[PDB]
Amino acid sequence: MNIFEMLRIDEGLRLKIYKDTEGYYTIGIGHLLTKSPSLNAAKSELDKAIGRNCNGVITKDEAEKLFNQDVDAAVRGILRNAKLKPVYDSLDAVRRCALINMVFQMGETGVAGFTNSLRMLQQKRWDEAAVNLAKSRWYNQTPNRAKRVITTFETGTWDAYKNL
């Protein structure tokens, strides 16, 4: 299993503009288009993103291209982030994937906000960190996905996804 397969399980794949769990216009593999309520603003962003008139629909290839960019930008974001980089550098390869997954879902800023949990992960206090992470709007709003990520940080294995 790798970051791509992991995120593919968590976000799903949709070839038609859709509304995410927060009600925002999304496409492909969790690619947020706009927080705006206008489906038109969404279609415009979509076209801007693919470089063609898509009329709200994209191919699998297009979805994958977007997904590659997004994973890439998530990693680069963590690496440029003064709060995130040290954590990421301290982690093993599996746990690194769990942090990338949070960043992909909630953005750099959002994750950078989990101060206490970040400190615990750095210190390698797995159990304590799994507990602190669960005390968040994130966990309450998308509990099954949060559980999988949290299990990944707790164990350092892909068990939560071997299921899936």
UniProtKB/Swiss-Prot annotation:
<feature type="binding site">
    <location>
        <position position="117"/>
    </location>
    <ligand>
        <name>substrate</name>
    </ligand>
</feature>
<dbReference type="InterPro" id="IPR023346">
    <property type="entry name" value="Lysozyme-like_dom_sf"/>
</dbReference>
<dbReference type="GO" id="GO:0016998">
    <property type="term" value="P:cell wall macromolecule catabolic process"/>
</dbReference>
<keyword id="KW-1188">Viral release from host cell</keyword>
<dbReference type="InterPro" id="IPR052619">
    <property type="entry name" value="Phage_lysozyme-like"/>
</dbReference>
<keyword id="KW-0378">Hydrolase</keyword>
<feature type="binding site">
    <location>
        <position position="32"/>
    </location>
    <ligand>
        <name>substrate</name>
    </ligand>
</feature>
<keyword id="KW-0204">Cytolysis</keyword>
<keyword id="KW-1035">Host cytoplasm</keyword>
<keyword id="KW-0929">Antimicrobial</keyword>
<dbReference type="InterPro" id="IPR002196">
    <property type="entry name" value="Glyco_hydro_24"/>
</dbReference>
<keyword id="KW-0578">Host cell lysis by virus</keyword>
<protein>
    <recommendedName>
        <fullName>Endolysin</fullName>
        <ecNumber>3.2.1.17</ecNumber>
    </recommendedName>
</protein>
<dbReference type="InterPro" id="IPR023347">
    <property type="entry name" value="Lysozyme_dom_sf"/>
</dbReference>
<dbReference type="GO" id="GO:0044659">
    <property type="term" value="P:viral release from host cell by cytolysis"/>
</dbReference>
<feature type="active site" description="Proton donor/acceptor">
    <location>
        <position position="20"/>
    </location>
</feature>
<feature type="active site" description="Proton donor/acceptor">
    <location>
        <position position="11"/>
    </location>
</feature>
<dbReference type="GO" id="GO:0003796">
    <property type="term" value="F:lysozyme activity"/>
</dbReference>
<comment type="function">
    <text>Endolysin with lysozyme activity that degrades host peptidoglycans and participates with the holin and spanin proteins in the sequential events which lead to the programmed host cell lysis releasing the mature viral particles. Once the holin has permeabilized the host cell membrane, the endolysin can reach the periplasm and break down the peptidoglycan layer.</text>
</comment>
<dbReference type="GO" id="GO:0042742">
    <property type="term" value="P:defense response to bacterium"/>
</dbReference>
<dbReference type="GO" id="GO:0030430">
    <property type="term" value="C:host cell cytoplasm"/>
</dbReference>
<feature type="binding site">
    <location>
        <position position="132"/>
    </location>
    <ligand>
        <name>substrate</name>
    </ligand>
</feature>
<keyword id="KW-0326">Glycosidase</keyword>
<comment type="similarity">
    <text>Belongs to the glycosyl hydrolase 24 family.</text>
</comment>
<keyword id="KW-0081">Bacteriolytic enzyme</keyword>
<dbReference type="Pfam" id="PF00959">
    <property type="entry name" value="Phage_lysozyme"/>
</dbReference>
<dbReference type="InterPro" id="IPR034690">
    <property type="entry name" value="Endolysin_T4_type"/>
</dbReference>
<feature type="binding site">
    <location>
        <position position="104"/>
    </location>
    <ligand>
        <name>substrate</name>
    </ligand>
</feature>
<dbReference type="InterPro" id="IPR001165">
    <property type="entry name" value="T4-type_lysozyme"/>
</dbReference>
<dbReference type="GO" id="GO:0009253">
    <property type="term" value="P:peptidoglycan catabolic process"/>
</dbReference>
